[PDB]
Design an enzyme around this catalytic site. Structure first.
Site, PDB file in Angstrom:
ATOM      1  N   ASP A 240      10.887  -8.432  -4.429  1.00  0.00           N
ATOM      2  CA  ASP A 240       9.481  -8.074  -4.298  1.00  0.00           C
ATOM      3  C   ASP A 240       8.825  -7.782  -5.641  1.00  0.00           C
ATOM      4  O   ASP A 240       7.601  -7.623  -5.698  1.00  0.00           O
ATOM      5  CB  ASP A 240       9.341  -6.815  -3.444  1.00  0.00           C
ATOM      6  CG  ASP A 240       9.811  -7.009  -2.021  1.00  0.00           C
ATOM      7  OD1 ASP A 240       9.493  -8.061  -1.419  1.00  0.00           O
ATOM      8  OD2 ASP A 240      10.486  -6.096  -1.505  1.00  0.00           O
TER       9      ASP A 240
ATOM     10  N   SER B 181       0.006  -8.004 -10.070  1.00  0.00           N
ATOM     11  CA  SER B 181      -0.033  -9.159  -9.187  1.00  0.00           C
ATOM     12  C   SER B 181       0.423 -10.399  -9.936  1.00  0.00           C
ATOM     13  O   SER B 181       0.224 -10.524 -11.146  1.00  0.00           O
ATOM     14  CB  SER B 181      -1.436  -9.419  -8.653  1.00  0.00           C
ATOM     15  OG  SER B 181      -1.430 -10.522  -7.764  1.00  0.00           O
TER      16      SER B 181
ATOM     17  N   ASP C 167      -1.487  -8.966   2.308  1.00  0.00           N
ATOM     18  CA  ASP C 167      -1.980  -8.010   1.316  1.00  0.00           C
ATOM     19  C   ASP C 167      -3.389  -8.362   0.835  1.00  0.00           C
ATOM     20  O   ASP C 167      -3.692  -8.255  -0.359  1.00  0.00           O
ATOM     21  CB  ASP C 167      -1.003  -7.896   0.143  1.00  0.00           C
ATOM     22  CG  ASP C 167      -1.286  -6.707  -0.742  1.00  0.00           C
ATOM     23  OD1 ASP C 167      -1.811  -5.699  -0.240  1.00  0.00           O
ATOM     24  OD2 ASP C 167      -0.997  -6.772  -1.956  1.00  0.00           O
TER      25      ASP C 167
ATOM     26  N   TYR D 173      -0.994 -17.841   0.202  1.00  0.00           N
ATOM     27  CA  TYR D 173      -0.884 -16.604  -0.591  1.00  0.00           C
ATOM     28  C   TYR D 173      -1.274 -16.888  -2.038  1.00  0.00           C
ATOM     29  O   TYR D 173      -0.456 -16.845  -2.952  1.00  0.00           O
ATOM     30  CB  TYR D 173       0.534 -16.038  -0.522  1.00  0.00           C
ATOM     31  CG  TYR D 173       0.727 -14.674  -1.164  1.00  0.00           C
ATOM     32  CD1 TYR D 173      -0.103 -13.601  -0.855  1.00  0.00           C
ATOM     33  CD2 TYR D 173       1.779 -14.448  -2.033  1.00  0.00           C
ATOM     34  CE1 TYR D 173       0.098 -12.348  -1.408  1.00  0.00           C
ATOM     35  CE2 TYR D 173       1.991 -13.193  -2.591  1.00  0.00           C
ATOM     36  CZ  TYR D 173       1.145 -12.148  -2.275  1.00  0.00           C
ATOM     37  OH  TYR D 173       1.357 -10.904  -2.833  1.00  0.00           O
TER      38      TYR D 173
ATOM     39  N   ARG E   1      -5.480 -11.494  -6.509  1.00  0.00           N
ATOM     40  CA  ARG E   1      -4.540 -11.217  -5.433  1.00  0.00           C
ATOM     41  C   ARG E   1      -3.984  -9.800  -5.536  1.00  0.00           C
ATOM     42  O   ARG E   1      -3.771  -9.275  -6.631  1.00  0.00           O
ATOM     43  CB  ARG E   1      -3.389 -12.221  -5.521  1.00  0.00           C
ATOM     44  CG  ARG E   1      -2.703 -12.513  -4.200  1.00  0.00           C
ATOM     45  CD  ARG E   1      -1.715 -13.664  -4.331  1.00  0.00           C
ATOM     46  NE  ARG E   1      -0.547 -13.309  -5.127  1.00  0.00           N
ATOM     47  CZ  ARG E   1       0.344 -14.183  -5.575  1.00  0.00           C
ATOM     48  NH1 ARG E   1       0.241 -15.476  -5.305  1.00  0.00           N
ATOM     49  NH2 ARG E   1       1.367 -13.747  -6.304  1.00  0.00           N
ATOM     50  N   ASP E   2      -3.717  -9.192  -4.377  1.00  0.00           N
ATOM     51  CA  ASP E   2      -3.070  -7.883  -4.299  1.00  0.00           C
ATOM     52  C   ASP E   2      -3.858  -6.818  -5.055  1.00  0.00           C
ATOM     53  O   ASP E   2      -3.343  -6.147  -5.950  1.00  0.00           O
ATOM     54  CB  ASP E   2      -1.630  -7.941  -4.806  1.00  0.00           C
ATOM     55  CG  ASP E   2      -0.880  -9.108  -4.246  1.00  0.00           C
ATOM     56  OD1 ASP E   2      -0.515  -9.057  -3.056  1.00  0.00           O
ATOM     57  OD2 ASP E   2      -0.683 -10.089  -4.988  1.00  0.00           O
TER      58      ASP E   2
END
Length: 358
Positions: free
Chosen positions: A313, A95, A135, A83, A88-89
């Site tokens: 989260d 992110s 994701d 990840y 990312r995301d």
């Protein structure tokens, strides 16, 4: 399939989650709830390699697992999440990724993979199962209108390809993240999703170590719902088993008899969201079905706990540079700390609301 990665192996328990849980359980005042909370440390979870700084931890877990196997007469299995994609995301408002496409993201990600491979290569008596990039690919199905995702598409594909190709060389069993029923399980998204995942599998050489797909990672959907959650209206695939039953044959037609793993770590309580897309610290979540290969489906190798329940989260503080407003919605538990850090009140409710009970 014939070869379920988990059968015949003892899962190495995360000591980090064990320590988080032990520290959490001694803050829980009710003695009965405290002992249920403490027992969560015995439930296997995935370790997220969300930065290069986590790679030395992977090395320690592999070495510890190898020694534990020898001390107990068992073959050990370490569960990880890859990840760290650049940008990312891409569809998120925020992110926490250290790499960016604009600053040599692809090369930096390749080096991150190389460091992971270099650890895994040293411990051939330990099996590794990896979830590949939550994701990520799912955004390339439905979110190409998000400009950050459109601009990340070639990097996501190249970086995921590099991860699959090189982790296969050290025999890692891999499940690519595939969103959840309310993301890719919409009937109209199934074929575009299958086309993308098949192309990715082909580019990585169709390695037998690419077992299939991981669903519901860090989410809250039922595997098999007694009745559809109202958030699902319009989608006949209202739970993960409907999604997987619908997607699997499309992959099989391409020559990939794919199997699946399903996160249930925060699925114990259904009907807790206002909208299906609300993903951040959903209030009232409970621990769900414990990990098991008794999955109820030909397509599913294991129910798993991928997202470690109790780790936030994302922050609800709108002044944080990492703030995503999803984390301030009415169905998000607030106040919430930064992503990945311990959220004690949320953990205590996960324990209290566990279903099946702990």
């Amino acid at each position: 399939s014939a070869n379920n990665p988990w059968t015949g192996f003892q899962i190495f328990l995360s000591p980090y989650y064990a320590n988080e849980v032990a520290a959490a359980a001694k803050q829980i005042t009710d003695p009965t709830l405290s002992s249920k909370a403490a027992s969560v440390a015995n439930i296997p979870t995935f370790t997220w390699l969300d930065s290069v700084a986590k790679i030395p931890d992977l090395g320690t877990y592999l070495a510890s697992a190898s020694a534990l196997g020898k001390s107990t007469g068992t073959k050990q299995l370490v569960q990880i999440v890859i990840y760290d994609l650049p940008d990312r995301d891409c569809a998120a408002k925020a992110s926490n990724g250290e790499f960016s496409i604009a600053n040599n993201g692809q090369a930096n990600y390749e080096n991150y993979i190389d460091q992971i491979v270099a650890q895994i290569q040293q411990f051939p008596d330990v099996r590794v199962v990896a979830v590949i990039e939550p994701d990520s690919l799912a955004n390339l199905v439905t979110n190409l209108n998000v400009q950050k995702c459109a601009n990340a598409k070639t990097t996501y594909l190249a970086s995921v390809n590099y991860a699959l190709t090189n982790l296969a060389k050290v025999g890692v069993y891999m499940y690519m993240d595939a969103g959840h029923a309310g993301w890719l399980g919409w009937p109209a998204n199934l074929s575009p999703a299958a086309q993308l995942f098949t192309q990715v599998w082909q580019n990585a050489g169709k390695s037998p170590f690419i077992k299939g797909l991981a669903t519901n990672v860090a989410n809250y959907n039922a595997l098999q719902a007694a009745s559809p959650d109202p958030i699902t209206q319009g989608n006949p695939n209202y739970d993960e088993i409907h999604y997987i039953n619908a997607l699997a044959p499309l992959l099989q037609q391409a020559g990939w008899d794919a199997t699946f793993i399903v996160d249930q770590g925060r699925s114990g309580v259904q009907n807790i969201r206002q909208q299906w897309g609300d993903w951040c610290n959903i209030k009232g979540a409970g621990f769900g079905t414990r990990p098991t290969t008794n999955t109820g489906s030909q397509f599913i190798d294991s129910i798993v706990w991928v997202k470690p329940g109790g780790e936030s989260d994302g922050t609800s503080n709108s002044s944080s540079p990492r703030y995503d407003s999803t984390c301030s919605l009415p169905d998000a538990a607030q106040p919430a700390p930064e992503a990945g850090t311990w959220f004690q009140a949320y953990f205590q409710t996960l324990v209290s609301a566990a279903n099946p009970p702990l």
